[PDB]
Structure formats: structure tokens, C-alpha cells
């Protein structure tokens, strides 16, 4: 399970850069006929704007879902850059052998040149429409033929495409300031990058959700993920002092002899490599990921208690978990400190607000230990915002290691005391146990400086702010794993390679970018759904997808409540500029798309008065209406939420004028005999019997010479009068000149996703490695 | 297991005739295969000769032409 998490993290590819090959379109021209007024038909035909892919459902709720789906299409298509030359094509009728942006645009231009029934002006316009360039600026202007909404979307994708000019300075500036300013690293590159180049910037916007505020199940997983990632980049302690010889110094100083190699209970039992490395890895990874770590030790082993002092000094106490260090401090006080002044053991209480070192700092009267314990109790992190990110920083006294001198002062004092209450052998054992640390003093100092340096160096490669909050699950830390580290160490510096840093930084960047981008997705759909009145829509599967695209969770064991709270927070986030503009371009044109689409209609008027039909021209005479004024209206989605067919039934039985509003199908009837027979009034009797309104299909009375009974109109002097008009708009007329636009773009750029691959990096020899204070680390011998 | 049966029937019937180009042959590609396995979790050794595990991940930067070699094998 553990290794899988890192497999998922390091397989987080960045957000795949988009580049479209064609243009987003909703509309297309289409030849229909034209019927001159009085109804009869021209020999000539005419182009009109119609919709590609009439797929609009019935009912208003389903239509608003459709426009949400359209928003989803446009977002999924929404690119990051584009080069128009790669999609451009020839124009087969251009004077200058020019080009145009899309194949369908070219098809239109090459189809209108061939028709008999096209003006000469458009043919001239086709001869004179061509591409143009200006190469000093690397800018191109291509023709295009585009519906205005299509032009709006495409023009937004042109003007708001996310790229940034790439140079050799920005490569450096992508690295943190500390690494550039750290003299232990040397950087260079073997390429100069032109101004023709480009690069995309990640979205490194900090946590909009505050998952460290009562999303503990997610924060536990996140913190665990970052911890285990940090374990894969903390260096292994490549070089050590020996184990057998060191243990022989322990067994020749302490006279537990012979063959205490095998007998293992006192001052020993976890001296090995395999814990020293664990502690070295764990401390740094925990402080970086901000993960609390619990302690599993034994009280018989007093060297563990002694090396816990060093631990509780160099590391803050608010970083651990409470009961463990309470036990450890209590133990230390009861058997190293208070017996060193003839004080009582202690009388500690389980649920006490203060830890033993606090309430012990004031009791005993010794300067050294008092100021040591003062430091310990008041040791804590320093919050500070640097490069935008919050950071938990060490004291700046731990870093330039002098805390260990206060520690040695205290321990030497305790050596100088007597233990009156206790025998000589016990004191002898303890005092030898702390002389064994005194003899390792300089190495401890060096270790402290080395941990601080590696910690800040790896802190540099972090993008998400690092909060100090306790967690559900912990990481075990045997105190023998400190004692090992404190006893197996010396004259062996380990500096993280620059490549590990770049790897870790790019991983965190990619996780953070994925996080923000998917947040923006979810926020976009939530805001859009809430502004389109979608009330039957359960906003869960979207959040399930959101958590699935973050490749660290287990959706099998996350509930609905966390999802809905996460949604409640996501409601309150501003939508990014791209998505917001595309949505406000859709709220102002969803109706204009919905006025089109000859498969549904926006209503039907029912006024029992023999009213006139309208002289349109793509049709002839029609029972169409385009204003919906006068008569009172009834919304059908209202009627289908709360079924109350009392009003409408009352209104139909009494032949009362009314309008019905909602996406309604329709069927064209080109029979004049269906006009005088009045079949469109025959459709509303099924609404009073079977109160459903779903199989409701009003009539459209399109009349023209293609109707087989039109001759009556041209023989009997009657304008078509009728009843029960339909509320519907007409298609728009295709103006070739006015539909033409010029699309601008950049000429021939190149997009580079990774940005540090051009950097080659090297380390100074780690013996001569230096900290903030311009003073060497790992120098005591 | 089944794969054991496959291996055994496929070696027993060829080891009755081939006795010079069988173990030398099939044991040779392995040297390339080791350069294809991503490390996820590691064991280390000190200069002082002690194991010490590492969660280090390492990819497998294998060139292209050794695959052609492997295919010939």
C-alpha cells in the first residue's frame, strides 16, 4: 500500500497541454428555398444559419442540462494555445492563392462559387479573401466565416490563451530563491533559448478550501502522501562510523561485560543502522509534511531517555503527540533530574493541562537545567510567509547549533550532583550513560546543523502552505532510533542532489496545479448549475470525479457528508476568468441557440379567435408568433413539479385565451385541408383526460406551393386565418460578407512544458558544505 | 503451477536434442531485463556494511537499441 502511493504521485503527469485542429462551431449555413409573398416559390434558393447536431431535449430543465453539457464540451475543448497555420488550408477560388483557417470554411467558399444562384459580389469577396502575415512581429491574420457566437468563443480562445514568453532568465526564476542563493550548489545550462519560444505557467494558487479546518480524513491522507514522498528524497546516511567498534566502546566504558552484544536490555537493543536512518528520514519528512509522530519506547532503557532530551530540544514539542512525550518527559524528570537534587520522584496527574517540563521548570533551582527546560518548553516553530508560502521554520538557534551547549551544561551539572536517595551503582550507570553523550557532543552539534540544513533545503521545494495541525494517524518513532543516530554518526555530510530537489519540486508543482485546476472545474460546474436553476441535480458524482482525479484517495471509504461540505465550501469560490467569461457568453446566448433548432418550440399560444398567419419567407404562411405579448402565460416546468392541472383544465374547458411556455416539440403539416379542418385545436383534449403533458405536439401550418392544395389561396382571395398560433422564431439569414472575420494569431511559437530539464546542476564537495552562518557543518573530529 | 508445466514441456522436449545452445541462450536476455524495472522502495548498504532501507524511487532509462538486441535474442 505504501509504495503504491508514491507510484501514483510520481505518475502524476502535468495538465496535458491542449491544441485544437479545428474551430468550435454550433451553426452552419444551409440552403433552403424562399417563397415570395402570396406564398408561391422562387426559382432561387437561399442560405440560412441552422444548428449543427440538433439534439435539444424536450422540457426546459432538460434544455438547461443540454447547455450545461455544451459548457462541458466547450471547457473540454477550451485550449491553452494554438497555431492557426497548422489548421489552415487553401482556398480554391482566391485571386492570390491565399488560405483560410478551417476546412469547412473553405468548403463553404468553394460551394458558393459554384452555385448559379449566388451574386457576383460574394464571388469577388472570395477572390479577394486571403491570408496575411507580418513576420517582424510573428503575427498572422487568416480569414474565417463564423457565426457571431462562434466568433465570440473562438476570439476568446485567441485572446485568452495561456502562454508566456520564455527566455533564459525565467528558467532561473522558476527555481526557489534559496537554492539560487545557496552557495553549496552550482547551476548552468548548455542552450540559449530564443524569444520565439513559449512556456505555460502552473496554477500555484494556495488552498481555497482550508482542508486543515475540519476535513481531517482527507488531510490525513494528504499529509501521509507528502510524508512518504519526502521519504523518497531525504538522503540515505551513506557514510557512518562503525557499529561493532562503537558498541565495544560502549561495553568497555560501561562495565557490563563480557558478551553484552547478545544480552540487550540496558542502554542498547536498538543501536543498529536500520533505525538511525529511520529517525533521520522520519524527522525531516514529518516536519516537512507536518505529520505528528508518536513514540514507542521502554523505560528500562535509559540511553533512549537520554537521547530523547536531544530530540525534544532540537525538535519542537508541539510537533509530537501529547501522551507520548508526556510519558517521556515524566520518565526523564522522575529518574534523571529530580533524583539529582534529592527531590521527590513526582506526583503527576493524568489529565493535567501542562507538561512535566513546564511545571518542573519552576520547581528545581539550577541555572543550567532551568534555562535548558525554558528553551525546551518555549521551543516552537516560527511561522513565516516566504515566496508566498507559509513555512514552519526552526528557531535560528537550533540551526547554528548551540542548544546542545545548554544541554551539555545541564548534563554536566547532573553529573556533578549526588543521588542521596539512591545507591552508588545506579548513579554510576546514569552518569556513564550521559558521559557517553558528552563524548559525542561535537557530532551531535553537526547532526543538528545537518538536519536543519537539509530540512530548509527541502522546504524550498514546496508550493502548498505547510500548516501545523495534529492528525489522526501517526508515524512511530522508537527512541532507540534516535540513540542509534546520535551514536552512529560522524564526518560524513550528505547534501540532497539538485536533481532530487528538482524532482520533488516538479512533483509538488504538478500536484498543486492538478489540485487548483480541478477545483476550478468543480467550482465552474457548481456555479453554473446553481445559476441555471438545476434543482434535481445531485452534486455528488462531480465531487466523486474531483476526488478520483486526485490520485491519492480511496473513494470506496469516503462518505457523502464530506463531499457535500466540500461542495458547500466550493460554492463560495470565485470562478476563474476563462470559465467565467465562457459562462457569461452562454447565459446571453443559450436562448438565441434555443430560438433556433426546428425540433422544439418555446411555446404555443391558444387564443380562440380566428387570427392571421404570418408572411415569413423561408416558409410561406405560418401560424408563428415571435413576441408572446397580450395573452397570459403558463410555465410548464412549474406545472410538472407540482401537478396542479386544475387551472389549465378550467382554462381549456371554458375556451379562455392563454399561452403555454416551455420547450415543446412540433410537427409541420403542409396540408391546407388541415387548416380549415382545424386540427391544431384538436391536440389539447388529451390534457384534460390523461393529465400528463409529455406527448404534446402542436402543429405548424407551413403553406406554400409544395402543399398540393395551395391553388385555393391563388383562386379564392383568402389570407390564411387560423387559431392556436405557435411561439417560435425564424432562422437567421446568411450574409456572406457580414459573416466574414479575420482571426489573429502568433506565427510559429514552440511550447516547452518542462522548464528545469535545461538546467544542469552540481554540488560542492560535501565536506566543505556550509550553512546560513557562513560556517562549516560536519567539522568536529 | 501451469507456467511451470509450460516451461517443463518446452525444455524437456528440446533438451533431448539441443545440448549446446539452450542454457546459454535463454539465460542471456536477463542481463537486459534488469534495466527495465522501476525501483519503488529500496535496500541500501553502508560502507560500514549495514542494511538501511530507502523509499527512493528510480526510473529505468533504457536505450532503444538494446530492445532490438533483445528481440534478436
Amino acid at each position: 500500500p505504501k509504495e503504491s502511493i508514491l507510484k501514483k504521485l510520481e505518475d502524476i503527469k502535468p495538465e496535458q497541454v491542449k491544441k485544437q485542429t479545428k474551430l468550435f462551431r454550433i451553426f452552419e449555413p444551409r440552403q433552403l428555398p424562399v417563397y415570395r409573398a402570396n406564398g408561391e416559390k422562387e426559382l432561387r434558393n437561399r442560405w440560412y444559419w441552422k444548428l449543427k447536431r440538433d439534439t435539444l431535449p424536450d422540457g426546459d430543465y432538460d434544455v438547461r442540462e443540454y447547455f450545461l453539457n455544451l459548457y462541458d464540451q466547450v471547457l473540454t475543448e477550451m485550449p491553452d494555445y494554438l497555431l492557426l497555420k497548422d489548421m489552415a488550408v487553401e482556398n480554391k477560388n482566391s485571386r492570390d492563392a491565399g488560405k483560410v483557417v478551417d476546412s469547412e470554411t473553405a468548403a463553404i467558399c468553394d460551394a458558393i462559387f459554384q452555385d448559379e444562384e449566388t451574386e457576383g459580389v460574394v464571388r469577388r469577396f472570395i477572390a479577394e479573401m486571403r491570408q496575411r502575415v507580418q513576420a517582424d512581429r510573428n503575427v498572422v491574420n487568416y480569414p474565417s466565416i463564423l457565426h457571431p457566437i462562434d466568433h465570440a468563443f473562438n476570439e476568446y480562445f485567441l485572446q485568452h490563451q495561456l502562454v508566456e514568453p520564455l527566455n533564459n532568465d525565467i528558467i532561473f526564476n522558476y527555481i526557489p530563491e534559496r537554492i539560487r542563493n545557496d552557495v553549496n550548489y552550482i547551476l548552468n545550462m548548455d542552450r540559449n533559448l530564443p524569444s520565439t519560444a513559449r512556456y505555460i505557467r502552473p496554477n500555484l494558487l494556495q488552498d481555497r478550501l482550508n482542508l486543515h479546518d475540519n476535513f481531517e480524513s482527507l488531510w490525513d491522507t494528504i499529509t501521509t502522501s507528502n510524508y512518504i514522498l519526502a521519504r523518497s528524497v531525504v538522503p540515505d546516511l551513506k557514510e557512518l562510523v562503525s557499529t561493532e567498534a562503537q558498541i565495544q566502546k560502549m561495553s568497555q566504558d560501561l562495565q557490563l561485560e563480557a558478551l553484552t552484544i547478545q544480552s540487550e536490555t540496558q542502554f542498547l537493543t536498538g543501536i543498529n543502522s536500520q533505525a538511525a536512518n529511520d529517525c533521520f528520514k522520519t524527522l525531516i519528512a514529518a516536519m516537512l509534511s507536518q505529520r505528528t509522530m508518536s513514540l514507542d519506547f521502554v523505560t528500562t532503557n535509559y540511553m533512549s531517555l537520554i537521547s530523547g532530551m536531544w530530540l525534544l530540544t532540537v525538535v519542537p514539542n508541539d510537533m509530537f503527540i501529547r501522551e507520548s512525550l508526556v510519558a517521556c518527559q515524566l520518565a526523564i524528570i522522575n529518574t534523571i533530574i529530580y533524583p539529582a537534587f534529592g527531590m521527590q520522584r513526582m506526583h503527576y496527574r493524568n489529565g493535567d493541562p501542562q507538561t512535566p517540563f513546564q511545571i518542573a521548570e519552576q520547581q528545581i533551582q539550577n541555572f543550567q537545567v532551568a534555562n535548558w527546560l525554558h528553551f525546551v518548553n518555549n521551543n516552537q516553530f516560527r511561522q513565516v510567509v516566504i515566496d508566498g508560502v507559509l513555512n514552519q521554520v526552526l528557531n535560528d538557534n537550533i540551526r547554528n547549533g548551540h542548544v546542545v551547549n545548554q544541554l551539555m551544561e545541564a548534563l554536566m551539572q547532573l553529573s556533578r550532583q549526588q543521588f542521596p536517595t539512591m545507591p552508588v551503582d545506579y548513579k554510576r550507570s546514569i552518569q556513564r550513560g550521559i558521559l557517553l553523550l558528552s563524548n559525542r557532543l561535537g557530532q551531535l552539534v553537526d547532526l543538528t546543523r545537518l538536519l536543519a540544513y537539509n530540512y530548509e533545503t527541502l522546504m524550498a521545494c514546496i508550493t502548498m502552505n505547510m500548516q501545523h495541525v495534529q492528525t489522526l494517524t501517526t508515524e512511530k518513532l522508537q527512541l532507540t532510533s534516535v540513540t542509534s543516530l546520535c551514536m552512529l554518526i560522524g564526518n560524513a555530510t550528505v547534501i540532497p542532489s539538485p536533481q532530487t530537489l528538482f524532482h520533488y519540486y516538479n512533483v509538488n508543482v504538478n500536484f498543486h496545479s492538478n489540485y487548483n485546476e480541478r477545483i476550478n472545474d468543480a467550482v465552474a460546474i457548481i456555479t453554473a448549475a446553481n445559476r441555471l436553476n438545476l434543482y434535481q441535480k445531485k452534486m455528488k458524482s462531480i465531487v466523486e470525479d474531483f476526488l478520483k482525479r486526485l490520485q491519492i484517495f480511496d473513494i470506496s471509504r469516503v462518505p457523502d457528508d464530506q463531499m457535500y461540505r466540500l461542495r458547500d465550501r466550493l460554492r463560495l469560490l470565485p470562478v476563474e476568468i476563462r470559465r467565467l467569461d465562457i459562462f457569461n457568453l452562454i447565459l446571453m446566448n443559450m436562448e438565441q441557440i434555443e430560438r433556433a433548432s426546428d425540433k422544439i418550440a418555446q411555446g404555443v399560444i391558444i387564443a380562440y379567435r380566428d387570427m392571421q398567419l404570418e408572411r415569413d419567407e423561408m416558409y410561406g404562411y405560418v401560424n408563428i408568433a415571435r413576441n408572446l405579448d397580450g395573452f397570459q402565460q403558463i410555465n410548464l416546468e412549474e406545472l410538472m413539479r407540482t401537478g396542479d392541472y386544475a387551472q389549465i383544465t378550467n382554462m381549456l374547458l371554458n375556451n379562455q385565451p392563454v399561452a403555454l411556455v416551455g420547450a415543446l416539440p412540433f410537427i409541420t403539416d403542409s396540408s391546407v385541408i388541415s387548416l380549415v379542418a382545424k386540427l391544431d385545436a384538436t391536440v389539447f383534449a388529451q390534457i384534460v383526460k390523461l393529465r400528463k403533458v409529455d406527448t404534446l405536439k402542436p402543429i405548424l401550418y407551413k403553406i406554400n406551393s409544395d402543399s398540393n392544395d395551395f391553388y385555393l389561396v391563388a383562386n379564392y382571395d383568402w389570407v390564411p386565418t387560423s387559431t392556436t398560433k405557435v411561439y417560435k422564431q425564424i432562422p437567421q439569414q446568411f450574409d456572406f460578407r457580414a459573416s466574414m472575420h479575420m482571426l489573429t494569431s502568433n506565427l510559429t511559437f514552440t511550447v516547452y512544458s518542462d522548464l528545469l530539464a535545461f538546467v544542469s546542476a552540481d554540488t560542492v564537495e560535501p565536506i566543505n558544505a556550509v550553512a546560513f552562518d557562513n560556517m562549516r557543518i560536519m567539522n568536529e573530529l | 503451477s501451469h507456467e511451470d508445466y509450460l516451461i517443463a514441456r518446452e525444455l524437456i522436449v528440446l533438451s533431448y536434442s539441443n545440448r549446446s545452445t539452450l542454457a546459454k541462450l535463454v539465460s542471456s536476455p536477463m542481463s537486459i531485463l534488469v534495466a527495465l524495472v522501476d525501483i519503488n522502495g529500496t535496500f541500501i548498504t553502508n560502507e560500514e556494511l549495514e542494511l538501511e532501507f530507502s523509499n527512493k524511487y528510480v526510473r529505468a532509462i533504457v536505450p532503444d537499441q538494446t530492445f532490438d538486441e533483445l528481440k534478436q535474442m
Binding site: 533559448l193 514552440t750 518542462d754 530539464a757 | 528481440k71
Partner: peptide, 28 residues
């Protein structure tokens, strides 16, 4: 056989792409 063999040769090219290589290759 050999159609599937050549496709096996091919799928070990597209896969396991290094990032520095594609950067220097776009430049080159």
C-alpha cells in the same frame, strides 16, 4: 506472427518518455 512482433517493437518506443529528451528534441 510478425505483425504482432513489429507492434511489440513499436510499443516500447512511445512508452517511457523522458522529459529532457523531448525538450532538447523540440529545440533540435
Amino acid at each position: 506472427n510478425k505483425e504482432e512482433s513489429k507492434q511489440l517493437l513499436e510499443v516500447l518506443k512511445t512508452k517511457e518518455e523522458h522529459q529532457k529528451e523531448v525538450q532538447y528534441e523540440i529545440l533540435q
